[PDB]
Design a protein around this ligand. Structure first.
Ligand SMILES: O=C(O)CNC(=O)C(=O)O
Ligand SMILES: [Mg+2]
Ligand code: NI
Ligand SMILES: [Zn+2]
Length: 331
């Protein structure tokens, strides 16, 4: 079996290998990349996402989110308080202000220490989940706005034609902005490209061990767990690496820098934080290997997680028994 210790693998495709996205994902899995839950893909040196980022300041972040924490330093939840709209230019200036800028630090490890020590005491503002793309339309390779759609994948594998569309999202981050422990909707893959700015640190639990993380989470967030049998779908819980180690949860960590892609694999729980002002783009995608995970994916029916239009059809077709109760949650 390849990659039996479930390490995060890093790939350096040639320009030729960068042509066929599906085939390269399947190559990475042939080498065991998926066992980690997360892989890093460094593009060939000939590739670019677009010519420059000099003209992005006028993108609007309609609903910036202030991420307010509650709990203890290593075990906390965050809620998102909606703020007034601002442009990317305004946001970048806010991220660089004394109140929000990255502190002096030695290296990524020192900054990681400072994050876990101090995150809870601040409420950074995240421009998350903004529909759009920063890939040039002329970028033909690994263009996250030109991938094969999940609806088309389901049709190709299972023969059923369904409604729905699949588009990318932009994420504008600042120091301490945080993504909570989650898998993707319907345990899809995701791909994330760090277009610009400061890094993003990732933590991940191998898919084969995801239920270990879930069990810990139910212990650490006991009222959340009573309220909903899939509360990590709410995307509000954080657990530090120290806490994971104390509880014997298998995980790995890696820092993504600008210019790099990360791929999360089905049922690969992940969480992380941004080091400073940055912009990432991400999208969900599927492969044939996903179908079995989509059929088994947990679902939030308490009503909190409230997800896209396009998830309806996935639930309807892959999880018809759940469908009724799940949609009661959506309505
Ligand atoms: O970058 C972020 O804030 C979160 N991204 C993801 O969870 C992802 O790409 O799957
Ligand atoms: Mg602009
Ligand atoms: Ni994700
Ligand atoms: Zn729920």
């Amino acid at each position: 079996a390849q990659n039996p210790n479930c390490n995060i693998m890093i790939f350096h495709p040639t320009k030729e290998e960068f042509n066929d996205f599906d085939k390269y994902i399947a190559y990475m899995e042939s080498q065991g990349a998926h066992r980690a839950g997360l892989a890093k893909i460094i593009p060939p040196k000939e590739w670019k996402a677009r010519e420059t980022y000099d003209n992005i300041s006028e993108i609007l972040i309609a609903t910036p989110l202030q991420q307010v924490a509650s709990g203890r330093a290593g075990v906390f939840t965050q809620y998102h308080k909606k703020k007034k709209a601002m442009t990317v230019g305004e946001y970048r200036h806010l991220a660089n202000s004394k109140k929000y800028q990255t502190p002096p630090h030695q290296n990524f490890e020192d900054l990681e220490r400072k994050y876990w020590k101090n995150r809870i005491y601040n409420s950074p503002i995240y421009g998350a989940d903004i529909s759009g793309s920063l890939f040039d339309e002329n970028t033909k390779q690994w263009n996250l706005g030109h991938l094969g759609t999940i609806q088309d994948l389901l049709e190709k594998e299972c023969g059923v034609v369904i409604e729905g569309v699949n588009t990318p999202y932009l994420y504008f981050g600042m120091w301490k902005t945080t993504f909570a422990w989650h898998t993707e909707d319907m345990d899809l893959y995701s791909i994330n490209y760090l277009h610009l700015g400061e890094p993003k640190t990732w933590y991940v639990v191998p898919p084969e061990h995801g239920q270990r993380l879930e069990r810990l989470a139910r212990e650490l967030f006991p009222g959340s767990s009573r309220g909903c049998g899939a509360f990590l779908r709410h995307k509000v819980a954080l657990i530090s690496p120290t806490v994971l180690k104390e509880n014997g949860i298998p995980f790995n960590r890696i820092t993504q820098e600008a210019g790099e892609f990360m791929v999360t694999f089905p049922y690969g729980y992940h969480a992380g934080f941004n080091h400073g002002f940055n912009c990432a783009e991400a999208i969900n995608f599927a492969t044939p290997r996903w179908i079995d995970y989509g059929k088994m994916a947990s679902q939030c029916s308490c009503g909190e997680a409230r997800v896209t239009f396009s998830m309806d059809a996935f639930v309807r077709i892959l999880q018809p028994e759940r469908y009724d109760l799940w949609k009661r949650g959506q309505d």
